[PDB]
Design a protein around this nucleic acid. Structure first.
Ligand code: MG
Ligand code: MG
Ligand code: MG
Ligand code: MG
Ligand code: MG
Ligand code: MG
Ligand code: MG
Ligand code: MG
Ligand code: ZN
Lengths: 56, 102, 66, 149, 64, 193
RNA sequence: UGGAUUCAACGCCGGGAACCUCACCGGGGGCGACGGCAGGAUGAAGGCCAGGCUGAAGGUCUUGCCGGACACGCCGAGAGGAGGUGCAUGGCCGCCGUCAGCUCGUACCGUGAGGCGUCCACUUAAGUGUGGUAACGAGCGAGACCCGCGCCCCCAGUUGCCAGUCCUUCCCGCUGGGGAGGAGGCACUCUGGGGGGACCGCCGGCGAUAAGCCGGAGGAAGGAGCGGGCGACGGUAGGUCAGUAUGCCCCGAAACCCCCGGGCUACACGCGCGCUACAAUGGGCGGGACAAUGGGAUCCGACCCCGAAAGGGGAAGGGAAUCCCCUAAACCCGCCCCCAGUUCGGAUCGCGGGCUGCAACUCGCCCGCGUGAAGCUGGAAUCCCUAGUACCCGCGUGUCAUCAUCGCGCGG
């Protein structure tokens, strides 16, 4: 078994694969408006804990 | 005499007011000339998510908001005043920044 | 220093009406204005209603078609 | 009398006609060709459009002071028919207005602050105010409620 | 549409009127000040609704 | 670094800390934390109901914990200390977790819920509500609300005064959701004394 | 590849997919923690020089290579699974429904299930209230509450504003007037903290004299001022295990992980929502005007230069009331067109020139010349909307390396 390991975690720099939620790890609907990186779901779950309020 | 800008920002008007009152009362404890807590435009970080995971059903949105209140205070720069405004408590949910105009 | 040519024109109308009244102290004139167009001296308070989700770009009540 | 006292379009055409008598206001060799912007569809239909354009720019620099090419680009831009697609605003080309500004700096009407754009000269504002007082007279034959000003 | 004094407004007004009747005038402004120095409210519209209700109660009493 | 960036960063970091500790100190009634960046270092304070459990065996736990803190999360110099909830029976996430812990022990849900309700309303709450939702009483799932006292649901006074807590009870056959809402002895608008 | 199919699927899954995303296809390569089993390091578990295969690969290999070191060659037992199950669950969402309902304590009625209250009449947006009443009281919900807008006062005056004052300077000239920069100061505007103000309060009428409705006055505001947020008990095996969490079943060295390429972008057709139009209530050309919301670090980028354009080079300032994005379009003035498949319409296609990116064929966006498709107002039927609303106009932002006929918002 003389070989070479080939998982190759490729470092994307732009793309839906480049960005990943820091909580769940989802790749698409990620919030990045003011330095966030969060899936819309997670954000809706935790926004109060961050201080976001729902007065409208 | 060269002046000192103090830009301070928070999410709580009351902590903000506490700090400004600290500064007012300390300047008048001494006699250095304050420039009022000029209130700057407050930042409304708005994030309009859809509140549904399913993608099914009527589309409904959560408009979440974070508010950052901002004040600036100009006070003449003295070593005394500077030492004590450094000694200020500056609670946890507040940022400050002492620039100096010279 | 504002929105549109009509809004500017109305704001100017208001401003100069008030100017004339406060320059002259003539209440017969004030009443002439207030019966021609009360909004000449009092302002129009109306503003635009915030747009709401369903086809929000169009309006607060403008809605998508079913 | 002055630019603010008279209207704009009349002044622009009159001062264009007068700018034809200036030698540093030659059109460039690519004028009879090109449009004024991507937002346009067709060549200018006039032959003296160059003079009309530099007249307009001259007046704009009178009014708005230390201004440059990008600001003027967004003023000379406009709406585009994007086909079946909806309409949007697009800026104009810069070469027309640049060559114009350079012609005017040659003729002596504008100068070029190192930063913050270009500024009308005394001889330039004299030129414009002369044409304006002239025009004001010719339409004071009409409105005496404008003779007032 | 519909502007109707709710139950707690009405109850509070009636109790105040019975407990301190000759303190409440026929003046809305005075009645306002009085409810405010009396009951804790912290709410202008509530204060004003209560004041209006005791105002017209006073009136109905003067009428019988 | 802009200022809103700073606020956002602090909130997100703290939220992830809170998540981790919620996972790891659920036996301890972990109510929450607070964080201050003193000059000598960043000192944090864990509010929980069993500091005995969070310290473990002579500071073992806080030690590996602070290691995790400075490593996995950007922290200058962690200075963990510990404190209690002054009235945990008025706190509602600690109670939700205690209830989930009970249901996992195997206690029947009616008994556990009514025990917790009795405890809270004796420890002095104006109101309490408890929803248990899931595979209770067989394979088809249902929801049961146990309530006592006086509790508001809607409005800013609800959003502020009542304390809400949520927990999962991971049992053999699946999850039981535990919602708890506690209204303490404090007053609302239409009182008007 | 899938999910969703009346309301409540079909510009929805923030679903604007070049790779990734991805779950589909063709091919290629890695993965057993813990134990034990075949063994054992003897120089190798593992990496590895030049090449052949290979799409390309120390993947593999004859040929050889050592930096100093254990075990899928075998079992269990697993890690991970965007694999199945949303009729196994949680959480969230939608709908019933921002509807006005849901209940309780005591009393009474009834053998009882249950009833009453919670009914009737007026009234209200409202089980909101008035009155009558075996009901009296209460609670959740509604309302109160929170956010914003609009008028006033106080405070505050920077990065905001510039009227007044002074200074300096440039033009017209009819010697009258206009602008610019400095101190000046917060006047005006504006900003943002705290207060006030509106309560059917006053007059009159209707209803019953009540609840309240209406008209009017005055007022910034007049009838919950306007607009939002907070969505009760509960149901809907509604949707979501393809966001996370989670039971069971399954894969488990493949149904786990990574890479290349393709696909999701195919098209005889049916449907939904929309964009552009079918012209004069206009098209083109040239001139003239007037916004707000928001956003900016490898990011906005003024300003200068180059270029016909798209775009290119350099670059002040700006971590945000300081700088920039940002002089909007509809509108107006003048000139051409004068009711026609047209100077309407811009499908399509050819040539060329560019930007992003590792990659632009499949399959991106932009520019220029050229081409010049249907379409001349639309049956049955159907949708949205009550005031700064609808219609019309453009702008911002989210998505974003580049891509907006979309979403959320902004003003005119
Ligand atoms: Mg009922
Ligand atoms: Mg409410
Ligand atoms: Mg009111
Ligand atoms: Mg279901
Ligand atoms: Mg189903
Ligand atoms: Mg055409
Ligand atoms: Mg025709
Ligand atoms: Mg979309
Ligand atoms: Zn997430």
């Amino acid at each position: 078994m003389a070989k070479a390991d080939y998982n190759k975690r490729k470092p994307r720099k732009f793309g839906k694969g480049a960005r990943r939620c820091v909580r769940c790890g989802q790749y698409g609907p990620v919030i990045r408006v003011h330095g966030l990186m969060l899936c819309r779901h997670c954000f809706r779950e935790i926004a109060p804990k961050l201080g976001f309020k729902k007065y409208e | 005499m060269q002046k000192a800008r103090i830009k301070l920002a928070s999410t709580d008007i009351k902590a903000l007011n506490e700090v400004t009152d600290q500064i007012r009362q300390i300047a008048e404890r001494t006699g250095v000339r304050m420039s009022g807590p000029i209130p700057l435009p407050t930042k409304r970080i708005r994030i309009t998510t859809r509140k549904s995971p399913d993608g099914e059903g009527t589309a409904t949105f959560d408009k979440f908001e974070l508010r950052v209140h901002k004040r600036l205070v100009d006070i003449e720069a003295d070593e005394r005043a500077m030492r004590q405004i450094m000694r200020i408590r500056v609670p946890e949910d507040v940022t400050i920044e002492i620039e100096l105009i010279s | 220093e504002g929105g549109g040519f009509m809004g500017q024109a109305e704001a100017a109308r208001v401003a100069i009406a008030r100017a004339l009244v406060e320059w002259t102290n003539d209440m017969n004139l004030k009443e002439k204005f207030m019966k021609y167009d009360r909004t000449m001296l009092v302002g129009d308070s109306r503003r635009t209603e915030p747009h709401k989700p369903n086809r929000s770009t169009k309006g607060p009540r403008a809605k998508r078609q079913k | 009398a002055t630019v603010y006292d008279v209207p704009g379009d009349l002044l622009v055409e009159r001062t264009a006609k007068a700018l034809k008598e200036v030698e540093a206001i030659k059109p460039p060799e690519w004028a009879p060709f090109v449009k004024t912007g991507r937002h346009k569809e067709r060549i200018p239909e006039q032959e003296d459009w160059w003079y009309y354009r530099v007249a307009s720019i001259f007046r704009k620099i009178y009014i708005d002071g230390p201004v440059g090419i990008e600001r003027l680009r967004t003023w000379y831009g406009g709406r585009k028919n994007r086909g079946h697609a909806p309409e949007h605003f697009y800026k104009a080309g810069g070469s027309i207005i640049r060559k114009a500004l350079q012609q005017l700096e040659a003729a002596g009407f504008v100068q070029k602050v190192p930063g913050e754009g270009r500024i009308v000269t005394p001889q330039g504002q004299s030129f414009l105010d002369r044409i304006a007082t002239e025009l004001k007279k010719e339409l004071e034959e009409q409105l005496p409620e404008l003779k007032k000003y | 549409m519909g502007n109707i004094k709710q139950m707690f407004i009405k109850r509070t007004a009636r109790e105040l009127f019975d407990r301190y009747p000759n303190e409440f005038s026929r003046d809305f402004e005075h009645n306002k000040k009085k409810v405010e120095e009396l009951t804790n409210v912290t709410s202008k519209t509530i204060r004003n609704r209560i004041a209006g209700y005791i105002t017209k109660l006073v009136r109905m009493k003067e009428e019988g | 670094m802009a200022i809103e960036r700073y606020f956002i960063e602090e909130g997100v970091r703290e939220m992830l800390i809170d998540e981790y500790l919620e996972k790891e100190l659920r036996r301890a009634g972990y109510s929450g934390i607070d964080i201050k960046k003193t000059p000598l270092g960043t000192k944090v304070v864990i509010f929980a109901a069993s500091p005995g459990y969070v310290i473990g065996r002579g500071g073992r736990r806080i030690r590996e914990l602070t290691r995790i803190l400075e490593r996995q999360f950007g922290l200058e110099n962690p200075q963990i200390e510990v404190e209690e909830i002054k009235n945990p029976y008025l706190n509602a996430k600690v109670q939700a977790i205690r209830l989930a812990r009970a249901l996992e022990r195997g206690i029947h849900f009616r008994r556990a819920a009514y025990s917790a309700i009795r405890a809270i309303m004796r420890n002095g709450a104006r109101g309490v509500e408890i929803r248990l939702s899931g595979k209770l009483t067989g394979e088809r799932a249902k929801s049961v609300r146990f309530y006592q006292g006086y509790l508001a649901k809607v409005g800013n006074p609800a959003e502020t005064l009542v304390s809400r807590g949520y927990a999962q009870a991971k049992l053999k056959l699946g999850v039981i959701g535990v919602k708890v809402s506690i209204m303490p002895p404090d007053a609302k608008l239409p009182d008007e004394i």
